[PDB]
């Protein structure tokens, strides 16, 4: 079932082909296939930030779950759902968070409410975990978006004729 | 640990050097250097906005918390967010918070149930503070954003054969 699941989005996506007829639409469909030089960029630069903001972020919560899936959802899924406006400020900002103590090592720990959250996040120098939030939304959220924009636009305004 | 994550971060931003190879890259990574100019305005445009919005938004909440961390987070941070879709009405408008009697002061109060909004805020004159949340939506989220998607558009274009 899984992979005729997968099957069916392609044979979907061949139906693209109909619009390669209309005079207004074909020429699209050809620009769209040379914007693909503009989001390998945008990806590349993405995930670069991702790593980057993602590997930081863990970093100072050392969540104690640390379980080598849910490592990966809180680097690469979670940073990447904030892009578009999902930001668990519960699961990241101490000051929402319930005091408790978890674990025997030194520091002081916050309860996240969120079940993939980590069951118990440090909140040594959690302005700092904030910070890179206000800093990731402006880069990835803001300017990279803007930047991709730009690209498509001039790449759009370039490539019309040909 | 945290000085660490950090620098951790400035490793992998580190790793952008390889696009400067691919000849389709390069010059992309280098039109990025040049958009600083626009950033900086974009920042220094919204950072006025955002502290015309925010300190007159909690002037007018009057919340009895008041203590000075929390007041930079209600007057900069919870903002902020705003502009990415984070908009905690429950924590502004007054018709959607319980009325209770928390300070002899006069006047009526409400009591907000987020953590950090505020043990208690003035109802005096609410809808100036949810006026002004569309004024800032509206200015901010997308006078500004779409203005600098703008300035990116000519920017790129411009330096883009430099």
């Given at each position: 079932?899984?992979?005729?699941?997968?099957?069916?989005?392609?044979?979907?996506?061949?139906?693209?082909?109909?619009?390669t007829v209309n005079?207004?639409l074909?020429?699209?469909?050809?620009?769209?296939?040379?914007?693909?030089?503009?989001?390998?960029?945008?990806?590349?630069?993405?995930?670069?930030?991702?790593?980057?903001?993602?590997?930081?972020?863990?970093?100072?919560?050392?969540?104690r779950?640390?379980?080598?899936?849910?490592?990966?959802?809180?680097?690469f899924?979670?940073?990447?759902?904030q892009?578009?406006?999902?930001?668990?400020?519960?699961?990241?900002?101490?000051?929402?968070?319930?005091?408790?103590?978890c674990?025997?090592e030194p520091?002081?720990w916050?309860?996240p409410?969120?079940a993939?959250?980590?069951?118990?996040?440090?909140?040594?120098?959690?302005?700092?975990?904030?910070?890179?939030?206000?800093?990731?939304?402006?880069?990835?959220?803001?300017?990279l978006?803007?930047?991709?924009?730009?690209?498509?636009?001039?790449?759009?305004?370039?490539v019309?004729?040909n």
């Open positions: 079932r899984t992979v005729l699941c997968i099957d069916f989005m392609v044979f979907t996506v061949r139906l693209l082909h109909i619009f005079k207004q074909g020429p699209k469909i050809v620009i769209v296939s040379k914007m693909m030089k503009d989001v390998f960029f945008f990806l590349f630069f993405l995930g670069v930030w991702l790593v980057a903001y993602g590997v930081a972020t863990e970093g100072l919560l050392r969540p779950d640390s379980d080598f899936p849910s490592i990966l959802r809180r680097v899924y979670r940073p990447y759902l892009i578009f406006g999902q930001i668990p400020q519960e699961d990241m900002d101490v000051a929402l968070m319930e005091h408790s103590n674990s025997s520091g002081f916050a309860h409410p969120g993939q959250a980590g069951t118990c996040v440090s909140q040594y120098a959690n302005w700092l975990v904030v910070l890179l939030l206000v800093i990731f939304l402006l880069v990835a959220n803001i300017l978006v803007n930047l991709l924009i730009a690209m498509f636009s001039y790449t759009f305004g370039k019309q004729g």
